[PDB]
Design a protein around this ligand. Structure first.
Ligand SMILES: Oc1ccc(-c2cc(-c3ccc(O)cc3)c(-c3ccc(O)cc3)s2)cc1
Ligand SMILES: Oc1ccc(-c2cc(-c3ccc(O)cc3)c(-c3ccc(O)cc3)s2)cc1
Lengths: 9, 226, 227, 8
């Protein structure tokens, strides 16, 4: 999910 | 934990964590089709989401949650956070919705395809904030509440603990405003009751977005709702 | 014109205006059995909710068009907050009717979300974890009636109900910090109940044109307001 | 509407 990655950056 | 900040430190962190107000890829020389508004508001919501994520990370207590919980809270509340942000910046614009400094719409092109009702409800919400003189310090608190409350069910009772601290923060503002205890907590109720209507507008806009079916990230947010 | 009440006059009037807890037909379960049993229970509860609404102080002071609007917008919220209240003391179970106690398992017999079922279980779990009082419940049900469909007198009544709800907290000996924190936790739950209603409303509108169960004349007219 | 008569 794109949402999961942005929170991990 | 980190949630030891006084109510005034809480206000400062939220005020400084505010996302910017983005612009629209809007062309006033071009007319407004049903798909023009559909395309404009979609791209604007999509570019706002990446700011909302980084804003959410700067909300006191949101970092303490797991990745799965942060995904869930943002998947349930993101359209409420855009909407109350929309309602907030449309306050000084009676009869109009200020989607962006260049994208100021009224109840004429708002009908441009499905559902106007939300539009008037957003106007009435903006009119509600206007009549009661919503202050920026009170807006940043409510927006935080939406992020934490909308998905508290949709361990972590510290979410309730942070929610309790935001409530304490809210009445702290109103007490330093000449508001009597009666005027204080009934004001608090008027604000929290508006969050019910924003939930309603969001659910209505949510199911509408699923019917008219964009951004890849926006599609990841739609799959959470149903 | 009953805006002069004290809080306990507001509380006792709301407690005395409570509709009864109706019984189901309950047969001692398919998707047609549940949706049929909940439909008939819902339709019979609607006629009591109407007479209860007339007995909410301030509701009769509104015009017929406004009374129709407030009820058409909040009627499922009111049923769900009642459902959630009378399910408190059945953890993990939903007490639709005293003879119709359902849990999450048969709650999956409907294509409509069990997430709505588990959301109702979560809401009743939150009521149980904070010892929600009946006097507070009737205040919250009144707020749903007057707030959900608001888009003055109704704002003066909601304020008065808020003061009423806080009178309850006051008595006794919870501190103001936990008195308006308790008020905040209560009202934020109304945001969830509105969510469960919209989610549940969109599924009832599905089984409307899907011909799953013969609905009620009165129940379809509430659904024409949500379309 | 049925809701009308029930409210009167
Ligand atoms: O910061 C924000 C960014 C976008 C939005 C949206 C507002 C609307 C909307 C609301 C009412 C109405 O009558 C028309 C549009 C959005 C929307 C876009 C497409 C669609 O099919 C449904 C809703 S997005 C708010 C704040
Ligand atoms: O007093 C009341 C009467 C009926 C109802 C309804 C509950 C549900 C439901 C909710 C969740 C779920 O998974 C299945 C059914 C109705 C549809 S109707 C609630 C209160």
């Amino acid at each position: 999910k794109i949402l999961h990655r942005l929170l991990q950056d | 934990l980190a949630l030891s900040l006084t109510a005034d430190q809480m206000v400062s962190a939220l005020l400084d964590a505010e996302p910017p107000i983005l612009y629209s890829e809007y062309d006033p020389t071009r007319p407004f089709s049903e798909a023009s508004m559909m395309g404009l508001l979609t791209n604007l919501a999509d570019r706002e989401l990446v700011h909302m994520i980084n804003w959410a990370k700067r909300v006191p207590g949101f970092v303490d949650l797991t990745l799965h919980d942060q995904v869930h809270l943002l998947e349930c509340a993101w359209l409420e956070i855009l909407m109350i942000g929309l309602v907030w910046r449309s306050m000084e614009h009676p009869g109009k919705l200020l989607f962006a400094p260049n994208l100021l719409l009224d109840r004429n092109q708002g009908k441009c395809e499905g559902m106007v009702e939300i539009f008037d409800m957003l106007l009435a919400t903006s009119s509600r904030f206007r009549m009661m003189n919503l202050q920026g310090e009170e807006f940043v608190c409510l927006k935080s509440i939406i992020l934490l409350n909308s998905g508290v069910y949709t361990e972590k009772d510290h979410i309730h603990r942070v929610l309790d601290k935001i409530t304490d923060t809210l009445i702290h503002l109103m007490a330093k405003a000449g508001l009597t205890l009666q005027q204080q907590h009934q004001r608090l109720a008027q604000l929290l009751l508006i969050l019910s209507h924003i939930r309603h507008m969001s659910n209505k806009g949510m199911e509408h977005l699923y019917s008219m079916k964009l951004s890849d990230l926006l599609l990841e947010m739609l799959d959470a709702h149903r």
